[PDB]
Design a protein around this ligand. Structure first.
Ligand SMILES: OC[C@H]1O[C@H](O[C@H]2[C@H](O)[C@@H](O)[C@@H](O)O[C@@H]2CO)[C@H](O)[C@@H](O)[C@@H]1O
Length: 675
C-alpha cells in the first residue's frame, strides 16, 4: 500500500544505513513518526518496478545518475526547498539532481573512487598503471598481490577505460548527445585491453568481486584496492595502515572515474511527501544528521557546506576530490542505466575471454545507444516461425504459427525465466502453418497452412474446431472480418476465398482477369467500416483492393518489379504498405488508390505492420527489421540478430498498446522488442 503515517526509506547496503537509522529515531522522537530504513538487494532496480504500481518506499537513496530515469517515468515527486535551504548546499550538487530543469531529489554527498594502499606493504604506490605488472611480480615473490578491486561492476573499471579517451555520451554545447557513444573508440579499447592483459598475465583474476577484494585488502593480502569513502570504515576496524591517493595514470593520462552524488528522492506515490521533506531537510541535511551517517560509513565530500568545512580537513577527503577532479559527474539522463548495463557486459565478457575487447566494446557501443532493445525470447517452435498474432484487448498472451506444423498459445510471464511460455501447442495441419490470427475474443485462432486448409481453434480447449476445405493449393494467408463473421484466405491456387464460420466457401475471387494471375500471398481487412474492403498481395507483382460488399475489384496497384509477399494496412485504413522481392516498401493511399512514396530497404521484405501509436512502419527483412518514421520517411531502427547461418525475421506484430514488438525468426525463435 501507500503507508500514510510512517516513513519507509531505502538505501544501499554499502552505506551507513545504521547511522541513518539513528537520524530516523531522532525524527520519530520529535515527530512521533516511525522511520523504517531497509537496504534491499538491487534496490535501484526494484524501485522503478514497485514505484510504478504505486508501492515502494517513501524515500530512495542512490547515486544521482539513476534519478533521471525515475523522474522520466514519473516515479519521483518534484522537490522545492526554500531559497534559504538551497544556499546551504553547493550549487553544483543541486545541478546533479536537476532533470528537465526541475529538482528531483536532495543531493547528499560527492562520491569518487580513489586508490587505497597498504602503507606497510607499499610505502610508495605506483603513479602509473603500467608499472603495476612488475609491482605484482615483486609482491607475488613475497606472497602478496599488488592490486585487487571489484571487476564485476563497471563503476570500478571505468576510470581506466575512460583514461585515454573512452566516454559515455558526447557532451557539447551544454548538452548530451545520447547517440554519440564513446565506449568503443581507441581510448576505451586501449584501457579495457590493458585490463584484460592484467588478467591474462595473471596479475588479477576475472572473478574478483567486491567482498573478495575488500577482504583481501583488509586482511593485508593485497597492497592496493580501489574504492569509495564508504570503505574507509571496514579498513579502520581492520587495523591496516592505509592511505588514499590519486588513481594511477594510463598512457600518461589520469584515470577518470565517474563521480556520483548520493541523493535522496521522494516517491511520487508517497502520501508522506511532507514528512519526507521535513526529514531530509531538517534532520538529515544538518551537521548532526550527516555526522550520524558519516560515523557509520563515510559519505565523502558532503553537499552541506557547513559540515563540509570540517570534512575537507581530512586528507582522504582531499584525495577523494582530487580523483573527482580528474573525472566528471555522472549524467542523470535515462540512458545511463543502458550505458552501465552495456559496459558491464563488455568488461565481463572481455575479462572472461568469451569475447575480444573489440568484440565486447563494439556490442556495448550498440547497447548503450540502442533505443528499442531485446526484451526477451520465447522458444518452443522447432522450425521457422511464420506468423504472430496479438490480442486486441492487449491481454497477456500471443499466438504463433510455424513450419513445425503447429501454432502455440504463449502465456506472457516476463519472469526472469522467459518473456513467455508455451501454454498449449495445437497440432492438426499436415503441412507448415503459414499464418495465424486471433478472434476479437482473443479466445480463438484462425490458421492457414500449406496443406491447403484453414482451421478455427478453440484456444482454451486446445482443439481445432473447423476445417475450411476448398482451396486446391497451399494457403498462404488468412484474416477475420472486423465483426469476425466472415473469413478470407489467400492461396497459391491464385484465388481469394470468403467463408462463413461453418467452413463453407461463400465466394471465390477466381483467377479471372479481375483477380490475380499468380499466387496470392496475403490478404488483410481494412479497419474502415465505411467501405468494407480487403487488400491482397500477389506474386503477380500487383496489389488489389476489394469491395467486401459486392466482392468487386476496386483497383489494382502496380509499382513492384517482383512478387509482393506482404501487405499491411494502417490502423485508420488510409495507408497501405506493400513489399516482397524487390526490397522496396511501397506506401499507398487506400482511399485514392495511388502511390505515395517509396522506402528502400535493399533487402527482401517478408512482413509489414504499422505501429499502434507512433507514425511507424516496420518491415521484416532478411537484413534486419527496418523501421521508418512515416513522417520523416527516415529509418529509426534496424534490428539485426546477435547470438552473443542466415537468420532473419519472417513475421512481426505489435502488442495492442504499442509497447512491444513480437517477431518470429527462421531459427524458430520468437524475439521480443521494446523499451
Ligand atoms: O557500476 C555500475 C553502477 O555504478 C554506480 O553505482 C555505484 C554507486 O554510485 C556507489 O555509491 C557505490 O554504491 O558503488 C556502486 C557500484 O557498485 C552507479 O551509480 C550505478 O547506477 C551503476 O549501475
Amino acid at each position: 500500500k501507500i503507508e500514510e503515517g510512517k516513513l519507509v526509506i531505502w538505501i544501499n547496503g554499502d552505506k551507513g544505513y545504521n547511522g541513518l537509522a539513528e537520524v530516523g529515531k531522532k525524527f520519530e522522537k520529535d515527530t512521533g513518526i516511525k522511520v523504517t530504513v531497509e537496504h534491499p538487494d538491487k534496490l535501484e532496480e526494484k524501485f522503478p518496478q514497485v514505484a510504478a504500481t504505486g508501492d515502494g518506499p517513501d524515500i530512495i537513496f542512490w547515486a544521482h545518475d539513476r534519478f533521471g530515469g525515475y523522474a522520466q517515468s514519473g516515479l519521483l515527486a518534484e522537490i522545492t526547498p526554500a531559497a534559504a535551504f538551497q544556499d546551504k548546499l553547493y550549487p553544483f550538487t543541486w545541478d546533479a539532481v536537476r532533470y528537465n530543469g526541475k529538482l528531483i531529489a536532495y543531493p547528499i554527498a560527492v562520491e569518487a573512487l580513489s586508490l587505497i594502499y597498504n602503507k606497510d606493504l607499499l610505502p610508495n604506490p605506483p603513479k602509473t598503471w603500467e608499472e603495476i605488472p612488475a609491482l605484482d611480480k615483486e609482491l607475488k615473490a613475497k606472497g602478496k598481490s599488488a592490486l585487487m578491486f571489484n571487476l564485476q561492476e563497471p563503476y570500478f573499471t571505468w576510470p581506466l577505460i575512460a583514461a585515454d579517451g573512452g566516454y559515455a555520451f558526447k557532451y557539447e554545447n551544454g548538452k548530451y548527445d545520447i547517440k554519440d557513444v564513446g565506449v568503443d573508440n581507441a581510448g576505451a579499447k586501449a584501457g579495457l585491453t590493458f585490463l584484460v592483459d592484467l588478467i591474462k598475465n595473471k596479475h588479477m583474476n576475472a572473478d574478483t568481486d567486491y567482498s573478495i577484494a575488500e577482504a583481501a585488502f583488509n586482511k593485508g593480502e593485497t597492497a592496493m584496492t580501489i574504492n569509495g569513502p564508504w570503505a574507509w570504515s571496514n579498513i579502520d576496524t581492520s587495523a591496516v595502515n592505509y592511505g588514499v591517493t590519486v588513481l594511477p595514470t594510463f598512457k600518461g593520462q589520469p584515470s577518470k572515474p565517474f563521480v556520483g552524488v548520493l541523493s535522496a528522492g521522494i516517491n511520487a506515490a508517497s502520501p508522506n511527501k511532507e514528512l519526507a521533506k521535513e526529514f531530509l531537510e531538517n534532520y538529515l541535511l544538518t551537521d548532526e544528521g550527516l555526522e550520524a551517517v558519516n560515523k557509520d560509513k563515510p559519505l565523502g565530500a558532503v553537499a552541506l557546506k557547513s559540515y563540509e568545512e570540517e570534512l575537507a580537513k581530512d586528507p582522504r577527503i582531499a584525495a577523494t576530490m582530487e580523483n573527482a577532479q580528474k573525472g566528471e559527474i555522472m549524467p542523470n539522463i535515462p540512458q545511463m542505466s543502458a550505458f552501465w548495463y552495456a559496459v558491464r557486459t563488455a568488461v565481463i565478457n572481455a575479462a572472461s575471454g568469451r569475447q575480444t575487447v573489440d568484440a565486447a566494446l563494439a556490442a556495448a557501443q550498440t547497447n548503450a545507444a540502442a533505443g528499442l532493445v531485446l526484451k526477451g525470447t520465447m522458444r518452443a517452435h522447432t522450425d521457422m516461425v511464420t506468423a504472430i498474432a496479438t490480442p486486441i484487448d492487449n491481454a497477456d498472451i500471443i499466438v504463433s504459427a510455424s513450419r513445425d506444423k503447429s501454432i502455440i498459445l504463449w502465456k506472457l510471464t516476463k519472469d526472469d525465466k522467459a518473456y513467455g511460455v508455451a501454454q498449449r501447442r495445437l497440432t492438426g495441419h499436415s503441412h507448415f502453418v503459414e499464418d495465424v490470427v486471433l478472434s476479437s475474443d482473443g479466445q480463438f485462432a484462425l490458421s492457414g497452412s500449406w496443406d491447403g486448409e484453414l482451421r478455427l481453434w478453440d484456444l482454451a480447449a486446445g482443439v481445432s474446431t473447423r476445417r475450411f476445405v476448398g482451396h486446391t493449393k497451399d494457403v498462404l494467408s488468412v484474416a477475420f472480418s472486423l465483426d469476425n463473421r466472415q473469413i478470407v484466405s489467400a492461396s497459391r491456387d491464385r484465388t481469394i476465398k470468403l467463408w462463413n464460420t461453418l467452413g463453407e466457401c461463400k465466394y471465390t475471387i477466381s483467377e479471372g482477369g479481375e483477380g490475380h494471375r499468380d499466387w496470392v500471398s496475403c490478404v488483410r481487412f481494412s479497419p474502415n467500416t465505411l467501405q468494407p474492403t480487403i487488400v491482397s498481395a500477389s506474386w503477380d507483382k500487383t496489389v488489389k483492393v476489394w469491395n467486401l460488399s459486392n466482392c468487386k475489384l476496386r483497383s489494382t496497384l502496380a509499382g513492384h518489379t517482383g512478387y509482393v509477399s506482404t501487405v499491411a494496412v494502417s490502423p485508420d485504413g488510409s495507408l497501405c504498405a506493400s513489399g516482397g522481392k524487390d526490397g522496396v516498401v511501397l506506401l499507398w493511399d487506400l482511399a485514392e488508390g495511388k502511390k505515395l512514396y517509396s522506402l528502400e530497404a535493399n533487402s527482401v521484405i517478408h512482413a509489414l505492420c504499422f505501429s499502434p501509436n507512433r507514425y511507424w512502419l516496420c518491415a521484416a527483412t532478411e537484413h534486419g527489421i527496418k523501421i521508418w518514421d512515416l513522417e520523416s520517411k527516415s529509418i529509426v531502427e534496424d534490428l539485426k540478430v546477435d547470438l552473443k547461418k542466415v537468420i532473419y525475421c519472417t513475421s512481426l506484430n505489435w502488442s495492442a498498446d504499442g509497447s512491444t514488438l513480437f517477431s518470429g525468426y527462421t531459427d524458430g525463435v520468437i524475439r521480443v522488442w521494446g523499451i
